[PDB]
Amino acid sequence: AGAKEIRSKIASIKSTQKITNAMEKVAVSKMRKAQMRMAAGRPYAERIRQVIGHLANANPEYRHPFMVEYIVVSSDRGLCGGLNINLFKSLVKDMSGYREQGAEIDLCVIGSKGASFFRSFGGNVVAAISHLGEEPSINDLIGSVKVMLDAYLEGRIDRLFVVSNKFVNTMTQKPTVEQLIPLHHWDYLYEPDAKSLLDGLLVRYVESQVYQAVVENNACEQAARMIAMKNATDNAGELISDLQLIYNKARQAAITQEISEIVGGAAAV
């Protein structure tokens, strides 16, 4: 219609571009916070692996079910660079292999986008929790984890796997699936009994690997959001650049028309 409307659209796109610029830097800061919370849980995991290892070896008479022959993590906010889709595309691929092999599948959903993917396709679920803070605590995962550990004990599930993105790098978020269940010289003094302790250690170890997974996926959410907000800022500029060319054409065209009208009237009067 004219030059008036295009100015409002160039101003509209310029305002949105400045906030998406900040959101990329906010996201980078939050990514660094989630990466230190990732490292403050490695000691509890590497030492318990050594204890669960040696304690089984010195006590061969007990072979916990977890040691002999899906939990899915999703975001609570948008702006991700298809991070939820890429994992949900690996969840569907592995589930297919089992449906072809003939096995049934029960599911645990952590986060909002996981629930959306299942309500949108009428999928089954046995446990679910969302609204976990950007800073999660292991206590929230205990309830959801318990519904899954008992299954494996009651035979309601033959194998348990955690589905989460892994923080390969600042530019890479590898979707992956790993099996949670099933899994020197001297010997330890056991209080009260070795069997009593092995049962306690194995639950602490599975609830630990699940917390490790949630926290890493939050770091992936922040990085993915950084790239998405960079893309949005760049795309906005391209629209601003294209509209500016149309505005210059509208500006030049308006001037020629007025001059013709002035000249036309003066050529009569």
Partner: protein
């Protein structure tokens, strides 16, 4: 032109080539001629060509010219910038950012260009 005929290489500095175009628009309006696109004089390309075609390398000497350029409404498609750019062999851009760094020449190595 006189120094070039002497056997020299000469520098011709033009303070602003946009003001040469505008003076032509003003004179064309005073003489009553019918205005062209965006209100410029109908003789816009010929008036630029008459000036710019004398600045060349002859078989005796060579007049090289440095001309400051102004862009109306920041539009590079406007008739004045469009016509002038058709006769330019190089573009030197001076940057306010580079000056803050402390490089006094202040020529932008990425935005500045040459057909040579």
């Amino acid at each position: 032109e006189k120094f070039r005929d002497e056997g020299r290489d000469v520098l011709l500095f033009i303070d602003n080539i946009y003001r040469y175009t505008l003076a032509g628009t003003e004179v064309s309006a005073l003489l009553g001629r019918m205005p062209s696109a965006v209100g410029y004089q109908p003789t816009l390309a010929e008036e630029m060509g008459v000036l710019q075609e004398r600045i060349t390398s002859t078989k005796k000497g060579s007049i090289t010219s440095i001309q400051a350029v102004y862009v109306p409404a920041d539009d590079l498609t406007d008739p004045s910038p469009a016509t002038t750019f058709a006769h330019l062999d190089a573009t030197v851009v001076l940057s306010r950012d580079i000056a803050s760094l402390g490089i006094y020449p202040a020529v932008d190595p990425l935005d500045s260009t040459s057909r040579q």
